[PDB]
C-alpha cells in the first residue's frame, strides 16, 4: 500500500527496499527556433534508485540517444524507468533483491508493476511523502557524471558517505532529505552553506563534506533556516 508518516520506521527495518524516483529521467531545454516556433532539446538524465537503509544509490544514467526517434517521451520515460529497475532487480542475487519498491510518483505504479510481473512477491507501493529526490542533480558529483556520459551507464554511490558509522539510517535519511530539500528550495544558498568553509573538504570518494558531529548540527540548523527563510520570502510571511 501507500507509504506515509505512520509506517515511517518501516523504511529502516530489515526488509530490503528501494525508492525509485523518475523525475530526472527525461530532461529537456526549451528554446525558440529560427522560424520562431519552440523546440525542445533533450539532455542526459538519470534514474534515482536508493536503498534508504544502506545508502546505496544505483544511479542509471539515461543517455539522450534512448529518445532518438521515439514519440510521447514523457510516457516512454516512465516505461524506460520501469524497464531499467526491473533489469537491475534481475541482475541482483536473490538474497539482494528488494521485497518492496516505493515509487515517488504514482504514474510509475503501472509501468513498474507490469515490468515486474515475473516478481509477484515484490510489492510496488506509492508514498504520501513529498521527497526531494529531484534535487539529486544539485549534487555536483552526480550532475557531473550524468552530463559527461556518452553512453548508457550505471554509477554506484553511497549517498550517506560514511555517516552510518556514527548515526542510524533513520537519522541519515533525515539528514539527506533536509539537504536535498534545501538544495531544491534555494540551491545557491544551500551550496554556500555546504562549501563556505575551505578548511572542510569532500573526500575523493564522497559526495558531501567531512563534517564533524558538531559541524553537522550547525549545518543542519543553517539548512532549516534556509528553508524557513525561503518559505517567508515566498508567502510574504
Amino acid at each position: 500500500g501507500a507509504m506515509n508518516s505512520s509506517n515511517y520506521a518501516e523504511l529502516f527495518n530489515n526488509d530490503i527496499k528501494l525508492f525509485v524516483d523518475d523525475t530526472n529521467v527525461y530532461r529537456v531545454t526549451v528554446h525558440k527556433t529560427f522560424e520562431g516556433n519552440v523546440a525542445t532539446k533533450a539532455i542526459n538524465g538519470c534514474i534515482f534508485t536508493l536503498n534508504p537503509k544502506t545508502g546505496h544509490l544505483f544511479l542509471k544514467i539515461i543517455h539522450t540517444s534512448v529518445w532518438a526517434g521515439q514519440k510521447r517521451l514523457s510516457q516512454l520515460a516512465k516505461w524506460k524507468t520501469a524497464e531499467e529497475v526491473s533489469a537491475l532487480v534481475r541482475s541482483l542475487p536473490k538474497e539482494e533483491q528488494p521485497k518492496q519498491i516505493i515509487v515517488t510518483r504514482k504514474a510509475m505504479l503501472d509501468p513498474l508493476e507490469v515490468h515486474m510481473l515475473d516478481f509477484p512477491n515484490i510489492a510496488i507501493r506509492p508514498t504520501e511523502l513529498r521527497l526531494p529526490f529531484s534535487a539529486a542533480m544539485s549534487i555536483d558529483k552526480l550532475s557531473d557524471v550524468v552530463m559527461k556520459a556518452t553512453e548508457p551507464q550505471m554509477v554506484l554511490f553511497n549517498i550517506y558517505d560514511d555517516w552510518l558509522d556514527r548515526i542510524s539510517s533513520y537519522t541519515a535519511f533525515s539528514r539527506l532529505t533536509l539537504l536535498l530539500r534545501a538544495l531544491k528550495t534555494n540551491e545557491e544558498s544551500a551550496k554556500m552553506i555546504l562549501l563556505s568553509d575551505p578548511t572542510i573538504t569532500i573526500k575523493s570518494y564522497h559526495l558531501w563534506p567531512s563534517f564533524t558531529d558538531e559541524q553537522w548540527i550547525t549545518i543542519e540548523s543553517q539548512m532549516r533556516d534556509l528553508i524557513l527563510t525561503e518559505y517567508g520570502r515566498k508567502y510574504n510571511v
Binding site: L76, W79, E83, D110, P111, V114, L117, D118
Partner: protein, 300 residues
C-alpha cells in the same frame, strides 16, 4: 412454438422470461408459458415476493428437451425439470392449454430485441460456463461467483467465464510490456480470439451471456466480465472491422434494453467514458455512443 409448463405456483413470485416480466399470486391457477419462439436460447427467472434475496433462473433451449417447472418446498425454489416421456408431456400441456392456464410469450412481430441480445449465445457454450452436466438447462443466480472472483468459494457453483486480467503474464509479452499494456491487440487477437475463443462469435456470445446474467440476476461478477470484454476490444488498436461494427450493434441493443433505473449499478463509468471517448475505438461505436449520450448523459 414450445412451452415451459408449471406444476403449480404455491408461492407468490415475479417471473421473468427473457426481457419480459410478470407477477403470479400465491396459489394462483398458473401453469406456465406457451408460444416460446423456437430458435433461440431463453431464460426463465424468478424473484420471490416475500424475499427479493436470490434472483435465480434457468437458461434453456426447447430444442434440447421438454422442460417444466415445479416448486420444491424443501429447497424453497421453483426448479426446472426434464420430462423424458414426450407423450405424457404433450398430454399435460394440452390440458393446461385447453383450460387457458398458460400465459403467452408476448412477442411483437416487429420486435427483434431478444434475437439482438442473444445473436451469438448458444446453449452448448452456456453449459461450459455453468457446469452441471446431468441437466440440459443451466441454473444461475444473483450470488454465484466467477472463477476469477474466486482467485482473489465452492467451485461447483461458479461461473467459469474466461479470465481477463490486463496486468497478467497472459496479457503481456515479456519484452513488449509498454506495447502490450497500452495496446491490447496481442491479448485480444492472439491470446483470446485465436487462442481461447477460436472466433469472434464465441467471444461475443460470452459477452452477451455475461450482460444478460448481470441484468436479469444482478450478478456482480457477470457485470465485471461484460465490462472487461468490452474494454479489451476498445483498448485494442487492431480489431477486424466487422468485429467493431458488430460490437456497436451488440452494445446498442444492450443499452437500449437496460432498465433506466438500474443504470447506476449496471454501468461502470470509468469503462464507458474510456471506451467512448479515450480508447482506440472511440470513433467506431457511433450507434452506442448516440444511445448512451441521449439516455444516460449523466454517466458521462
Amino acid at each position: 412454438m414450445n412451452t415451459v409448463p408449471f406444476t403449480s405456483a404455491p408461492i407468490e413470485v415475479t417471473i421473468g422470461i427473457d426481457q419480459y416480466s410478470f407477477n403470479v399470486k400465491e396459489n394462483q391457477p398458473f401453469h406456465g408459458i406457451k408460444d416460446i419462439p423456437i430458435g433461440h436460447v431463453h431464460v426463465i427467472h424468478f424473484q420471490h415476493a416475500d424475499n427479493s434475496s436470490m434472483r435465480y433462473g434457468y437458461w434453456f433451449d426447447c430444442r434440447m428437451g421438454n422442460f417444466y417447472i415445479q416448486y420444491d418446498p424443501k429447497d424453497g425454489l421453483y426448479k426446472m425439470m426434464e420430462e423424458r416421456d414426450g407423450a405424457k408431456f404433450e398430454n399435460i400441456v394440452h390440458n393446461f392449454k385447453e383450460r387457458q392456464m398458460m400465459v403467452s410469450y408476448p412477442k411483437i412481430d416487429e420486435d427483434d430485441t431478444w434475437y439482438n441480445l442473444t445473436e451469438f449465445v448458444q446453449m452448448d457454450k452456456i453449459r461450459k460456463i455453468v457446469r452441471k452436466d446431468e441437466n440440459q438447462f443451466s441454473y444461475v443466480d444473483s450470488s454465484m461467483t466467477t472463477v476469477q472472483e474466486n482467485e482473489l468459494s465452492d467451485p461447483a457453483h461458479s461461473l467459469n467465464y474466461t479470465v481477463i486480467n490486463f496486468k497478467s503474464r497472459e496479457a503481456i509479452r515479456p519484452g513488449h510490456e509498454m506495447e502490450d499494456f497500452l495496446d491490447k491487440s496481442y491479448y485480444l487477437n492472439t491470446v483470446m480470439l485465436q487462442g481461447i475463443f477460436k472466433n469472434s462469435s464465441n467471444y461475443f456470445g460470452e459477452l452477451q451471456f455475461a450482460f444478460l446474467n448481470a441484468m436479469f440476476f444482478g450478478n456482480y461478477g457477470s457485470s465485471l466480465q461484460w465490462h472487461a470484454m468490452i474494454e479489451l476490444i476498445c483498448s485494442s488498436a487492431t480489431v477486424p472491422k466487422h468485429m467493431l461494427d458488430k460490437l456497436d450493434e451488440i452494445l446498442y441493443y444492450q443499452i437500449k434494453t437496460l432498465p433506466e433505473q438500474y443504470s447506476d449499478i449496471l454501468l461502470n463509468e470509468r469503462v464507458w467514458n474510456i471506451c467512448l471517448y479515450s480508447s482506440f475505438q472511440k470513433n467506431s461505436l457511433h450507434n452506442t455512443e448516440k444511445i448512451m449520450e441521449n439516455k444516460y448523459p449523466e454517466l458521462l
